[PDB]
Mandelate racemase/muconate lactonizing enzyme (Roseovarius sp.), 1856 residues
Amino acid sequence: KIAEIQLFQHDLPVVNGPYRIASGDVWSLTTTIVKIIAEDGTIGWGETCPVGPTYAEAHAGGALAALEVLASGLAGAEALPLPLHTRMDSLLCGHNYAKSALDIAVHDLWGKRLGVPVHELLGGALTDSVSSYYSLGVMEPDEAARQALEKQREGYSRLQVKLGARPIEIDIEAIRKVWEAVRGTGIALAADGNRGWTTRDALRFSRECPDIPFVMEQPCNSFEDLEAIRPLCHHALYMDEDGTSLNTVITAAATSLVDGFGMKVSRIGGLQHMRAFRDFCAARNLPHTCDDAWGGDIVSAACTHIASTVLPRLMEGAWLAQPYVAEHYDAENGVRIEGGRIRVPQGPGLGLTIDPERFGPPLFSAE
Amino acid sequence: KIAEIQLFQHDLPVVNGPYRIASGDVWSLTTTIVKIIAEDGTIGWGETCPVGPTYAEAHAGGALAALEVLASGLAGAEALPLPLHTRMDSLLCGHNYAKSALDIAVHDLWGKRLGVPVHELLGGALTDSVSSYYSLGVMEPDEAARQALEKQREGYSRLQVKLGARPIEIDIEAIRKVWEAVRGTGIALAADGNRGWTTRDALRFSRECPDIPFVMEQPCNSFEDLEAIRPLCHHALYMDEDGTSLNTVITAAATSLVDGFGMKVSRIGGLQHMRAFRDFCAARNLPHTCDDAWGGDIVSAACTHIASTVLPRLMEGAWLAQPYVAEHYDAENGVRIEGGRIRVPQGPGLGLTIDPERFGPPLFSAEGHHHHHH
Amino acid sequence: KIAEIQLFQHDLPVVNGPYRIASGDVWSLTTTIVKIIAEDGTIGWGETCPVGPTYAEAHAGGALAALEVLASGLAGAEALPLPLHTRMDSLLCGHNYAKSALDIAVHDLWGKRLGVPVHELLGGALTDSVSSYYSLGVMEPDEAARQALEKQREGYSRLQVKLGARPIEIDIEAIRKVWEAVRGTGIALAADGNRGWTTRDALRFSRECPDIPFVMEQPCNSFEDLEAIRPLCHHALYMDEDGTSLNTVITAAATSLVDGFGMKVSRIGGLQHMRAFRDFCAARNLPHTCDDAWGGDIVSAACTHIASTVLPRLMEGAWLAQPYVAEHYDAENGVRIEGGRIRVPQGPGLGLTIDPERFGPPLFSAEGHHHHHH
Amino acid sequence: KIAEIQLFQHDLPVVNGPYRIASGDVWSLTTTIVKIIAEDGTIGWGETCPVGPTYAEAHAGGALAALEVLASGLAGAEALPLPLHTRMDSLLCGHNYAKSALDIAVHDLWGKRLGVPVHELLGGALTDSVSSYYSLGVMEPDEAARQALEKQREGYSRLQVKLGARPIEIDIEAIRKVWEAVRGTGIALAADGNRGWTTRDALRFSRECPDIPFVMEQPCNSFEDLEAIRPLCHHALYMDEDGTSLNTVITAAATSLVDGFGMKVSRIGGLQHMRAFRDFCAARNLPHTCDDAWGGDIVSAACTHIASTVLPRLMEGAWLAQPYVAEHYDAENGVRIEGGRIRVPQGPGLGLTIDPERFGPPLFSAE
Amino acid sequence: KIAEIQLFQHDLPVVNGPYRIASGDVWSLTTTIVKIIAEDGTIGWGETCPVGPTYAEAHAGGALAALEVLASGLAGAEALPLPLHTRMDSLLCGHNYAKSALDIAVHDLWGKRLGVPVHELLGGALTDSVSSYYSLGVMEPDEAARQALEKQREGYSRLQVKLGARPIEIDIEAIRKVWEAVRGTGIALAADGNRGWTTRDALRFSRECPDIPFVMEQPCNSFEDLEAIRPLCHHALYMDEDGTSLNTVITAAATSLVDGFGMKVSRIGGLQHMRAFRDFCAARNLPHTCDDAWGGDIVSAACTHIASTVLPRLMEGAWLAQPYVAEHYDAENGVRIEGGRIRVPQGPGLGLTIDPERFGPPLFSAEGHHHHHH
Ligand SMILES: [Mg+2]
Ligand SMILES: [Mg+2]
Ligand SMILES: [Mg+2]
Ligand SMILES: [Mg+2]
Ligand SMILES: [Mg+2]
Ligand SMILES: [Mg+2]
Ligand SMILES: [Mg+2]
Ligand SMILES: [Mg+2]
Ligand SMILES: [Mg+2]
Ligand SMILES: [Mg+2]
């Protein structure tokens, strides 16, 4: 049973920032960290870190406020996923990104109690290393082409080119220059509009580039706009920002609106829901990423554990903010991308050993 | 231009509570108040008050947290609706219920500057008084039928019966008993499932009651569930909780998914978006309410002003929390439901005079590029 | 790691048989049992038992033949769900009902290794006891109404009336008589057509009985037939036999073809897929059962463990063959329906202790890269 | 009336194997042979041979087990197609591939009794020779191009290129190299994904190759995925693996989901159902093949007889495993591909004379 | 090989006529008979007989004209179904009702050559006797109810009530009176609108009679009209006149437009196409009849042979003109309805022996590449 919950926040400056996105650039991020303490004194860590306040319907102050409400009613709840989510949903409607942090912490605590990695609790890892993909922030076409080649040479299996908040002509220039730089290396390519394109411009982006094998990731602002362009674009379409619940995913998958997903653990509400999402995609043969918005070692561990349980043929990559984060929470064991790939942790829980005072005194504590 | 913004919270205990909802009951509510101060010293007031944390994706602590972000980036902005919303959207994605409070305050400030009521700024009132509807919490069928007749007798033109969080047969019993009590009085009837029914049970509710003239208000948990039952229910269907943006409303109206709406000002993001919603419903001949989740005189004034601008034949009623709120913010001018109807305010702005210290010291304030946690 | 796999078959005569189904009656059943032995000597048990050879695309000889293929390729594999299913799918396409038995055994082994009940591995039980439903075989209308009241009186929360293989007017007579016997008791009612009705007759069944609150469970023979009647029937529609994979379930739920499911663990391919199914139904607010075709304590334990993890408002009941099965495999711990409900096991794994020789010598065994026909 | 049923199995090593398919490669196949004996002592032969256990929901041990159940309840049934299927369906739900073998045997027995070829019983042959198509197993792009030209020169009217279980880039390379080798010869081309492609990759396959006139055969894993790509691919789409019943075919044909079919006799449940399938396709002007999964002379004869009754303009070819099978069951008369074409048998029944002991003693016999 | 083809016409006055149809009444009918003679002297007989010139796109003079074209191009062709239809389609587009007669004759010849009944060539009879249905012409409601009971008492398993060419209220009166007379007897009921109803009136017919278990057979004039009413009628809908080819049937079955068919052998183009139709309906679990427009023993034998091959639960009945036909072509073996059922013939071919001069001298004959108008 959960005995105590502590909340903290921590600044994560963007190494070589800003990191530039159609829906809003970021210079520094404020992560929200949860520590759950069981009646036996063992602890589990969780984390949620929105990519600033305009990427999605989520912000650092919102995480903390929601987590205060959740934490205030969670003492005595069983530290297992279904009992946890049952209690959380009785306390607060929605706020998946906040609930995610407590879900992560429960999986950490559960794995530590049973002496198994989180990937075991999620059904069993299929691999001991996972692929990643690199995200090029919005930048000059020439710089994107340069960095694309560089990251291919580092060993990334896939590259995501962020686009938008500028004329579509320049986005098309950027994707052509990137493709010219990396064609024949076999690296996979995603064009991410981050909700930034009118249907007018998304139609043009696809029409002009039949022989560039990108997938279009969330080109347009709404689910309905994805529906508008779907029958008129011969390139694959992925959902990202619109995938705000398992219910909405089921609507998209069942109607074959999309060919795949960028999926964030916090958006969907934690590992409990991410594992259902994984199983949905496996049933439907839909590729997907295993990401979160941002974060340090705790988020990185959560993504890596779930990524390890995905059929490699469907796993498009686990993106991590790690390259943009200066300091590990666990200096020796924190997950890191090496050669464009990530080693799966094999110790109990998330595989982290973080000093209970790593983040200073709690901002809030319940029980 | 906005010179300063102050945020407050205030407790509103429910008069004769609790107020019982299928998605979660409420005993007492924390409202979040905004005061905007113009460079010239004039003030405008706004308010947002979720009905606890489980009724919608909204809570009092979330209102405050979002308003801190918004307030921190608003000094210097023009107190006009479109400039305001452009700025707010650049500072924070979504959180309509928080943005609503600043929108209301801006409309108050703007009306006071020009010397006209908010209803004028919204295009002009079509009436000096508006209809309301009474919402029966979930309660025993027999208690429901009694209270239904009582409220019809008070003069309410419409009754909403809250249902759910119990077997469907009890909901059907309750709607039948209510109908038996009020049939022949001409009172309009809504059956509010509060997102609480499976499609199984929504189908049964309609199927068993062809001769009871309810509309089914948000019977099921999702937009997709509304789509499922729509072709299979011969009773009118209204959207409420799922109407989370103008975009989503346009998707529903354009596809004729629904025959009307329960609409809350906070959910849609303030009066600027409510006025667009009104115009969309007028174009589509779709009836709607003009409500909010909860609140005192500031929210009630906002709802009444927009309600006054709706063609009465399409205005299903402005529901107010006022009967459940113990104290007015403005004892002279605060809106009250009288005989099931509401008199439209005629002063400048929202038509309220509220002491600048009515809610105590601020919790938070922003002036220029600085902010202060008090 | 899996060291050895043994296969057995065992006869289960129907207590007071036959058990009468529209797609084919059953007098006695041959169950197929799997025992997995870990390198450390711990054992896990699984089971699959078709209701004869005509109820589904499944039969006892087919279970054994498929398990021989699967078992022959499984030594050395990790006894974890995802590794197991990846391996099984590489050895044999489809045959979910066979794969289910190995899935169950793996969950038993895994729970025993970690010292926790299967319901914990499935995310955590939400309850210490689960509801059940009673299934009335096809029988005279008058016998049906009598037995319906009898089973309501025992405490069952739900009754399934099997129908078909006779004129539709007799099915309608039977559902009306049953309803007249139990109406007012609050017991839920399902009308199971067992794939046996033409669309002609399904339309009539619903059309004639608007005030009888049944759900129609798999009235017709195909997915396409469900699609045909869906827009024309105002009663809820549930899928059963057509739910042959998670993919197909997603097609049905996503298009709102159905309002719920009868689901069998063997049909969907084991607990790993049942847990996904549960999560899909939770996301879509779709009620479902947690059943299997037939079986003894191993199947019954599997169903009860998954059932314990479902929100009670969406769990239509865990049907067990247990009342029709003469003998327990584990006399101490084998699950029994008591007062129409089932106590959730709390021991490690499935919560069973079954003698390694309970089913006699193996018919087949695999260890490493060798197999043996006994 | 049927007096006795005997079951046998027989090994068929793949000549120059393995034979390589996206859904699973095969090195040797185990066929299941049925002999029905009438009350007058005359016999009919049937056969079913899954292409290993992961191609479809079918396997050699499953055939035998199902056939045991069927055989155990078939004594006394009339040896005519509708009475047979009526009895079989009363004994066992589904298992079309098993039922197929008994159906074939009944057509053989029926033709022998009446002294007419099976093609007469199926409505009358329209031709005395039929076209075939050759199936290139998954192989290197260069090797495929080489073998494609070779098989065109042998006289095949159509070539099927098996693809998948590798990056789509290589599949596209393979089809372009094949097309470069055979363009202008007029040979028809099919690209068979064998369920191996995500919708992402099937969209790309078509988009990149508008001027290569392939049909895409079962590119994706499910019926729903075929539905997803149909409005977004300007190449013709054929169903193969998803055509598991006449009911499902009717859904696909009636909704114009597909432009044609790869159809296997065993999948659809025998010649009785294949002849209905033929008539459906004729009504809808949909081309189709006349195939089975694998097998020796008995299967080959069944395919050839039904193929002979198809309007040549709609008959895409009868594929036979015969080139991969070392030994005929009937050395003198077993059907064989010659010059890419197959001579239609003209004797009674299937046109086979097989020693009653050709396969050794029965594994099982009923009555 | 076909050596010679002879064509005849013969008058069939309606016994106790006229026979009244919404699309046009009939007093007497001209049948068109084909005799095919094989190179070896064996003969096969076929027949086609429209119900006058306004019931369908077909008439006796058109049958003869089309048969002259077909016959002129058929000498030397193999008397097997697929070779025949390939040849016929190369000579003349459409005219199924004419082609049917040659198809029937070929099946007769083929059966006689092999020494087996036509039902064997069609895959094997599943029964030694088949059900029939009686068709009540349009008549006063009271006369309809009387005759309905009379025919139920004779043993008919199903009754078709012809309707239309009068106000819909009279049709509704008639179906209600009929139902009141036969309800409780278990007799199946079809309401045949004969293409005669506007969608307005079809909607009313169904709407007013939810508790009368008719199927609506071809209520409206077009395929599009069936599509219009389908989503708005809770009674089963059957296609008849619109089922003009296998292609069109596949369009209807595949889209679940209908729940069954009235099917005529001549309309679909003969037994080869009827057998395909049967197999399509079996795959889709769609009930159907096995009828033809009119005719004597040759048509009746054809219908009975195909009917014998249909699963009895899907065979709604083989309607025959036989009760309205004064004279048999074969007095010994001609099929007769007895107790509402028909005994399946068991001789070779159609099971008929008809004198080669039964219909007088030929009107037309073809041998080799020559033809003769007599
Ligand atoms: Mg993205
Ligand atoms: Mg005025
Ligand atoms: Mg509401
Ligand atoms: Mg417990
Ligand atoms: Mg209706
Ligand atoms: Mg069932
Ligand atoms: Mg195009
Ligand atoms: Mg293929
Ligand atoms: Mg016979
Ligand atoms: Mg008719």
Q: What stands out?
A: The two ends of chain A are 12 Å apart (CA to CA).
